[PDB]
Amino acid sequence: AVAVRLGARAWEIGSCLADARRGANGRYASWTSAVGGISPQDLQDRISAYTAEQALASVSVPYLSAAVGPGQSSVSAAPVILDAFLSTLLRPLTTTR
Amino acid sequence: AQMRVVAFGDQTYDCSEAVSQLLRVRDDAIVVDFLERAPAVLKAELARLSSEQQEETPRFATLAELVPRYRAGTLNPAVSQALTCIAQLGLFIRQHSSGQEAYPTAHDSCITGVCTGALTAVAVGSASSVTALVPLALHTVAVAVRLGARAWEIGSCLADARRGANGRYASWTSAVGGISPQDLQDRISAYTAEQALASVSVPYLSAAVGPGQSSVSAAPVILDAFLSTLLRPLTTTRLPITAPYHAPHLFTAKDVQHVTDCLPPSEAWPTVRIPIISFSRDEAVSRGASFPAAMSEAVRDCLIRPIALDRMAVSIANHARDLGKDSVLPSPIALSFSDKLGPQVNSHLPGAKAPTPELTSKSIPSAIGAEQQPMAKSPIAILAASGRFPQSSSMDQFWDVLINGVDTHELVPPTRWNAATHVSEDPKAKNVSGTGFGCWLHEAGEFDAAYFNMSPREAPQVDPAQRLALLTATEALEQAGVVPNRTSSTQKNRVGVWYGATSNDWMETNSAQNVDTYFIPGGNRAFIPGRVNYFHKFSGPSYTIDTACSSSLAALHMACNALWRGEVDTAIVGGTNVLTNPDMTAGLDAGHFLSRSGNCKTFDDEADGYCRGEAVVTLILKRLPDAQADKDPIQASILGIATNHSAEAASITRPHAGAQQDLFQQVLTETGLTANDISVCEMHGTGTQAGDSGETTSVVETLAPLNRSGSAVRTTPLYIGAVKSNVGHAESAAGVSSLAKILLMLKHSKIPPHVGIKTKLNHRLPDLAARNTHIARSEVPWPRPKNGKRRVLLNNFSAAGGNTCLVLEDAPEPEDSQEVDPREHHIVALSAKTPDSMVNNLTNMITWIDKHSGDSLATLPQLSYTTTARRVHHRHRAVATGTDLLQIRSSLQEQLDRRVSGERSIPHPPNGPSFVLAFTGQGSAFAGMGVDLYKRFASFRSDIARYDQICEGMSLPSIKAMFEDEKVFSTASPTLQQLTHVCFQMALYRLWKSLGVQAKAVVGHSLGEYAALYAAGVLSQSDTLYLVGRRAQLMEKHLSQGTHAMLAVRAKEEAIVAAIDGPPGEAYEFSCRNGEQRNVLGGTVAQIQAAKAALEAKKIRCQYLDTPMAFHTGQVDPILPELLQVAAACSIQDPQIPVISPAYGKVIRSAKDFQPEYFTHHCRSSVNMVDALQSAVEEGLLDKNVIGLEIGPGPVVTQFVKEAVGTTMQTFASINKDKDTWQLMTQALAKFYLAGASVEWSRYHEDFPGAQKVLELPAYGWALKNYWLQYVNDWSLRKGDPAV
């Protein structure tokens, strides 16, 4: 029961922060992506620079949701903003959905 | 520092009660599994017995058959030992699984047993959990069976069953008190030396129970002979041990090894971890041995060693004294004299004995949905029942005929078949019947075809059984208040439809006179439930059951099985019997089944058959938790049902009473109810002397046992009655008719009179008065016991030998919230598929109102709930609104007057209404707006809290106090005011959408565009909030209050331009263009005053506005750049519906027109409402048939839309300041419903529990018409003749 409630609350906040895509056709987008080849702090600095350059509401900026390893991490954001930020990352940085 | 002991007992303890308690357990999966697997292992081990011993073992399907034999003393030693072991293990498992007891551990617990508990002792000391214990427990059950069989074999070899046994098994031991063991041994030795007995038949000392008591064992005859030698003051007591045990002179290691040869060898056997106290053996402590080794030790102790029962306590205490403990907390299971165990053990210890704590309440609650009992063997709740009976058209008329004791039997009406040709007192012709009487339905051919999508020619060819099944199923579904797909349990694929039928007379005699396209589908019996599955779009099973005169009950059984297995969540169980084929009656008469004089004279001394009675009945069924969660009207519960066959009868037709008594005992045992719990018995009572007497004898024997002294065991009266004396024999619906009678009796708390007995009681029956059972000849009160339930037993038998019976229980105590619906105005909705049905519904509703005018206050909220959220709304519709019930009555009466006068009803258009959602600006925002909704709607409160959290996240003022305090509106800053306005608009739009409001277009006015954009899908909630907050922040930081102002002028623009001195754009600015004769100018204070003076000089009305800042003027110039940047941050997206933008004076349908340039132009440009509305009208988006909804604190924009579109366009307001919020909401919803909209009524009443209750509103006003095919020319009496 607790897990159901937690999922429902996270879903409420997420759906309030963004809208389902027009071409979703039932499937649910992904709010997270693993980034490899860059240290967690350097990726945080990249996020901060992207936020400063771009104009973003404080409740829509991408955030570092996990620090997996010394060269791997997980970054989360709304589908559109996550897609926009990920393309800013160039090789040899790896992105996984 | 307090040890515990798990002490098990021997066969002396009576374990039948424990067996029954364990069999009744329902809420423990592990206990149920153990009790299901133990009997199979026991039967498998019994199949491996000797030839002699297998003829002295009974056949049992379940352990519920060994309890009566265990009590009667007719159980052989093997089965008795196994049952003792099963009881002990089950009690331990139930205690330590359902009781949430910590499993014994080798540091705080010990085990102990005596001669049968030494097996369970090792079984429990080997495991570490209940799951790890079950298999060892089954192994131990097998070992116990073998041990008992071996002892029984030796005993039977040593002696013969005396000629005066007659089932019972004689005791082989007796307790002797008053003499020390060392002296009773000398007595035995002297008696042996004197009597000169064989060394194997000599009595022996089988136990040392104490310092002046012991137990001596021997064969019955020798035991009696030796006991007769014992004199006072020595006392002798006879124990129930039926085989020799503890005999070193009768058993050797060979027997011990044979007993334990059912355990296959392996190296995976567990050892024993919890120490076991073995007081009989040389060493008291036993730990480390494997499972089979310790099991063989236990068997050896039980067969070869004498019980040292005088050293158990001293042993246990010693163990406790070894570990340094100071007290013992005994935990005996099925032990005898257990109450003394604790004091006896603690007598040897220094002390410190202390009490024990409490159970700690239920020890945490169960999660919602986990508080139930498994679907297997759960009560089956009855939700509603409808039916057509003789001289009746409802259940209420059925009770009228019952309570008044009427005899409905009559001759055959001419509609079915003639009587001057089809009947004779002395039938001499073929197919002629000796009887002609029956209880008929004279409105069987009365159907509402159009309601069920049936052609006028398809209807006459449908069996009246199908038509009446459809009618009664629809009525019962309405009464239960269940709508397809309404909830989880009413999903269209979780609803099966079982039925019971036994004839197709319509096919045989009525529709076979001219075969046509609907012959097969009309007549076939599978279509009876097929039509119910099809029309209501139920996609679950659909069966018809034919067990002759028990079908309806048999079918019922089927449904329950499904409910118990999970195939369906809801069942529609019916039963129909319509008589139209004369040959069926002729053959029932030729077979000597029909009374030749009248109705069924049940219990009468002149009972000579039965009378056929037509009837149709339908019931709605669910599992009890399903009906409790859905808040359904529960009438009764079914606790159990079973079936068997009367195979041992002396013929195919006539019944047999032994099988009936077995069935009754089986259902009583499965339900766990004693004979006293049942209060009524609706007997089959067909009206046959032999059958009536046999059924009465079986019923009284089961429920009214007679004591050995000839008295009665019942402490309360018992009543027996038969429906068939009133309405007759249905032969397919008899069970459902009886169930309907029971439901009515439970409803009215009465027992009707009996009318079958006409002259005198039947002399074959038992003496009912002596048994405390009565046949009420006059109606009797049947009150429901306080804090209790009324339980009934129902039976139904068939001429084919099938017997069905069930047990009924009173529905639980209803506990409504009893809360007061805070609302003021309520709606009542009525619907129909025909104008005539609309009139009928209105008339019946006003009649119900008249009957229920003065009940209470909750009646109106509950009636609104029942009419809105628990009904299916057809095309023709009607609605009423009121604050009390009399207003509802008057409104509906006026509507009925209009309808009757000639105002024909028109169905609402198939598509329904189209809604344009107008959003209002920040003009009419007053104090305490939305507080009513914020308090009386949970979704609104959640949305407001979410918006508040979001806003506080992005550094914006909280908008929560604005919906709670109402004292903050005075100090509300412009940014706070605009944030509150936007949040209110969004929350209100979402609230209206959740009620079924779908916008075909959205138009805002200078602040409602943002919320209109969100409603269109361009922006998200967070984007809208951020954009509005940032715009307000810019306005507040840059601009200064008071510099500018705006003026509303009611005159054309041309006149305003001509009158004012100077050109537009420089002298002033057209801030808003709302209508042809409404405009708003904007400018500085000096310019505003000059324009006001100039305009008033020309006699034109002007009004001021209280806007602190300026909007749509030049004062917003120094903030446009930054705003643009902010507008770039958002994530614009294509809208689902057109956005009527006044900033561009257009109607946007693409994201190409929603760039940041748009969000600067809107701020700076003017509100060209007129152009935007004109463009929308030209495109055809807006017209008169559209309906406007104002999402804002006042209906201002809807006025502009009304002016633009025309003059006969309906418009509605969400809230206001001079009206009631719920009054407006009710008017809006009523007009939407009348338009043809599909309102989400269930969400309306969600937050008001007080109105959650289904009332027994009148039935649908069927526009019945007569579709009937007439049997003509008496051809059924010439089946085989030529045209002579």
Backbone angles phi, psi at B963, to 5 degrees: -110, 0
Q: In chain A, which residue's Cα lies nearest the Cα of B953? A: A59
A-chain CB neighbours of B1133 within 8 Å are: 19, 22
User: Is residue B986 less than 8 Å (CB to CB) from chain A?
Assistant: no
For residue B1090, what are the CA distances in angstroms to B213, B1041, B1045, B1063, B1078? Answer: 124, 19, 12, 14, 19
Q: In what order do the strands lie in the sheet with B802-810?
A: B542-545, B495-500, B570-577, B615-623, B380-388, B636-645, B802-810, B791-797, B678-682, B718-721, B773-774
For residue B1179, what are the CA distances in angstroms to B133, B1148, B1173? Answer: 79, 12, 10
Instruction: Using the structure block, give the residue that is written with the tokens 């206050």.
Output: B857
In a 13 Å sphere around the CA of B660, the CA atoms on its Cβ side amount to 28
Q: Output the CA torsion B822→B827→B828→B829 (10° steps).
A: -140
Q: Out of A1, A59, A80, whose CB is closest to B1131? A: A80
Q: Is B684 a catalytic residue?
A: yes
In whole angstroms, what separates CA B241 from the centre of its chain?
48
In a 13 Å sphere around the CA of B271, the CA atoms on its Cβ side amount to 8
Q: Out of B946, B1128, B1133, whose CB is closest to A19? A: B1133
Contact predicate B761/B605, CB 8 Å: yes
Q: Output the CA torsion B393→B394→B399→B402 (10° steps).
A: 30
Burial (CB count <10 Å: 0-12, 13-18, 19+), residue B657: buried
Which stretches of B574-648 are DSSP H helices? 582-590, 624-629
Give all strands (DSSP E) within B218-295, no chain letters: 235-238, 276-277, 285-286
Q: In what order do the strands lie in the sheet with B999-1003?
A: B1146-1148, B1139-1141, B999-1003, B915-919, B1187-1191, B1211-1213
Q: Which residues of B327-337 are buried (b: 16+ CB within 10 A; e: fewer)?
A: bbbbbbbbbee
In a 13 Å sphere around the CA of B991, the CA atoms on its Cβ side amount to 29
Alpha-carbon distance of B1192 to B982, in angstroms, equals 9
Provide the experimental method for this PDB entry: cryo-EM
Instruction: Using the structure block, give the residue that is written with the tokens 């049968």.
Output: B116
CB contact under 8 A, B1129 and A55: yes
CB contact under 8 A, B1022 and A60: yes
The tokens describing B130, both together, are 């209940």
In whole angstroms, what separates CA B395 from the centre of its chain?
23
Contact predicate B1276/B430, CB 8 Å: no
Per the document, the length of chain B is 1284
Catalytic residue among B96, B536, B684, B1245: B684
Same domain, yes or no: B597 and B712 = yes
Same domain, yes or no: B577 and B719 = yes
The CATH code of the domain that includes B754 is 3.40.47.10
B518 C-beta neighbours (distance < 10 Å), count:
18
The CATH code of the domain that includes B940 is 3.40.366.10
Contact predicate B1228/B879, CB 8 Å: no
Contact predicate B1015/B991, CB 8 Å: no
Alpha-carbon distance of B916 to B494, in angstroms, equals 39
Alpha-carbon distance of B769 to B66, in angstroms, equals 33
Cα dihedral B69, B70, B73, B76 sign: positive
- For residue B582, say if its preceding peptide bond is cis, omega within 30 degrees of 0: no
CB contact under 8 A, A16 and B1129: no
Q: Output the CA torsion B1124→B1129→B1135→B1141 (10° steps).
A: -20
SS3 of residue B382 by DSSP: strand
Residue B300: name the closest of B152, B199, B150 by CA.
B150
Alpha-carbon distance of B1035 to B974, in angstroms, equals 9
User: Is residue B193 less than 8 Å (CB to CB) from chain A?
Assistant: no
B40 C-beta neighbours (distance < 10 Å), count:
10
First CA to last CA across chain A, in angstroms? 28
Q: Are strands B380-388 and B410-411 parallel, antiparallel or unpaired?
A: unpaired
B residues 1007..1026 contacting A (CB < 8 A): 1017, 1020-1023, 1026
Angle between helix axes B1021-1038 and A2-17 (nearest 10 degrees) is 50
Residue B1191: name the closest of B964, B826, B936, B916 by CA.
B916
Q: Is B319 a catalytic residue?
A: no
> A63 - beta bridge partners?
A76
Q: Out of B368, B946, B1126, whose CB is closest to A16? A: B946
Q: Out of A12, A22, A59, whose CB is closest to B1022? A: A59
CB contact under 8 A, A16 and B1020: yes
**DSSP class per residue in B772-797:** TEE--SS-EE-PPPTTS--EEEEEEE
H-helix or E-strand spanning residue B1178: helix B1169-1179
Q: In chain B, which residue's Cα lies nearest the Cα of A55? A: B1129
Which stretches of B1017-1165 are DSSP H helices? 1021-1038, 1053-1059, 1085-1097, 1120-1129, 1156-1164
Domain encompassing residue B792? 380-809
The data reach a resolution, in angstroms, of 2.5
CB contact under 8 A, A1 and B1017: no
Residue A42 Cα, gap to closest chain B Cα (Å):
24
> Choosing among A19, A56, A81, which should be mutated to test the B contact, i.e. which has the most B CBs within 10 A?
A19
SS3 of residue B27 by DSSP: coil
Q: Is B1161 a catalytic residue?
A: no
Contact predicate B757/B606, CB 8 Å: no
B1184 C-beta neighbours (distance < 10 Å), count:
11
Same domain, yes or no: B805 and B921 = no
B719 residue type, one letter: Y
Q: In chain B, which residue's Cα lies nearest the Cα of A12? A: B946
Residue B317: name the closest of B344, B297, B299 by CA.
B344
